[PDB]
């Protein structure tokens, strides 16, 4: 009945004023990409930075099990696009936000499915 809730601990640490997880791996790219959230190669547009996925995954970085029942990782082996305004904390960003299953953009940072 007991599970560590690392997502919550990080959210609360951030709210308490803790320094975000660092050493996320930022990639060089054109910044003319599709802007989709999680891609097989860097796809940052002009408003985004692209990062190596594993380095932005709370579970990968904390050496803990992934909440997937199969332990699978959405980020490892891919690239994650982070709004430049949130690039000081990619792990917090990926943890708090959600990818539109339709258009592949971050809900709230690219997804225009709910009326353009």
């Amino acid at each position: 009945a007991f599970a560590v809730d690392a997502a919550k601990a990080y959210k609360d640490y951030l709210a308490s004023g803790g320094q975000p997880i660092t050493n996320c791996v930022k990639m060089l790219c054109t910044h003319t990409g599709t802007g989709q959230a999680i891609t097989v190669t860097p796809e940052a547009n002009m408003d985004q930075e692209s990062f190596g996925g594993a380095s932005c995954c709370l579970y990968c970085r904390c050496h803990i099990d992934h909440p997937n029942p199969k332990g699978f990782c959405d980020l490892k082996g891919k690239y994650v696009q982070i709004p430049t305004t949130c690039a000081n904390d990619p792990v917090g960003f990926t943890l708090k936000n959600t990818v539109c299953t339709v258009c592949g953009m971050w809900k709230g940072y690219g997804c225009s499915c709910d009326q353009l």
């Binding site: 930075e49 594993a54 380095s55 082996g77």
Partner: protein, 301 residues
């Protein structure tokens, strides 16, 4: 200059042809630093420039490409170089990486342990190594050929590099091995490539381009390293990050290079000519299976 807009500088052929004696490496630009783009790590920049240079060679790029990356962990527990290689390589390329120390990676599989514990059933199309022990940079003692992981790498190349495949192995003034240089003469072409971002360092990547499985050329590795240091000592390289800003042509072209299985008898001069041009890979196209040897001990009583 010209050179500052390149990703780096390759050792000019004429320096390869010398018979220098080994001297101490004294770099004019030691202590200079390139101005990296905001938030970009040295490792990312360095691998980006290495890959930009590799784009200018005749690398074989088959379907179901197999790449292995040694020395891939950082002190911060991530794998920046692996991330650049996976960006560079065609999507779907099988990428395995390894380090003595634990790290989290975007590679398809990661083995933690001494490289000497690493075994693979299959052959590889490209081998990258950034393995380095900073305890070799002892300037007060003689600079002899080093063994350690270099001995592993030389065997790994001869046993597990596909014909037509390529390598890039990081060396420095003190981190080098004579047999590895000798093995460069078993490729159609070779060089020592210095990245412009890290040009203040005696680091280079020794690149073997298109493996032939036999000597094309007899290289004395003690002399060749002295040649490399002579070049470095007399050719200051301007630190530059210029090439990092143009990634438009970065991805490695998926050439669909042909792969054939062949027995050492059927490798004739026509096969060798195709190998030499980056037009052919020779190896099995079986499943990729790797492992790490684990030493078992019970410390109780």
């Amino acid at each position: 200059s010209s050179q500052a807009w390149q990703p780096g500088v390759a050792m000019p052929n004429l320096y390869k042809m010398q018979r220098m004696l080994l001297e101490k490496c004294d770099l004019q630009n030691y202590g200079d630093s390139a101005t990296l783009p905001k938030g970009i790590m040295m490792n990312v920049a360095k691998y980006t420039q290495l890959c930009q240079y590799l784009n200018t060679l005749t690398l074989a790029v088959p379907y179901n490409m197999r790449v292995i990356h040694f020395g891939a962990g950082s002190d911060k527990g991530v794998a920046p170089g692996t991330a650049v290689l996976r960006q560079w390589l065609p999507t779907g390329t099988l990428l395995v990486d390894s380090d003595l120390n634990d790290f989290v990676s975007d590679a398809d599989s990661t083995l933690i342990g001494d490289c000497a514990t690493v075994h693979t059933a299959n052959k590889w199309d490209l081998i990258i190594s950034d393995m380095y022990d900073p305890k070799t940079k002892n300037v007060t003692k003689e600079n002899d050929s080093k063994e350690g992981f270099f001995t592993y790498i030389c065997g790994f190349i001869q046993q597990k590099l596909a014909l037509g495949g390529s390598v890039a192995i990081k060396i420095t003034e003190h981190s080098w091995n004579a047999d590895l240089y000798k093995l460069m003469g078993h490729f159609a072409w070779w060089t020592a490539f210095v990245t412009n971002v890290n040009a203040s360092s005696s680091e280079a990547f020794l690149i073997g381009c298109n493996y032939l499985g036999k000597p094309r050329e007899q290289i004395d590795g003690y002399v060749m390293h002295a040649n490399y240091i002579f070049w470095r000592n007399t050719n200051p390289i301007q630190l530059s990050s210029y090439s990092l800003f143009d990634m438009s042509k970065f991805p490695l072209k998926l050439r669909g290079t042909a792969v054939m299985s062949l027995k050492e008898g059927q490798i004739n001069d026509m096969i060798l000519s195709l190998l030499s041009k980056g037009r052919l890979i020779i190896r099995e196209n079986n499943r990729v299976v790797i492992s790490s040897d684990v030493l078992v001990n019970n410390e109780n009583l």
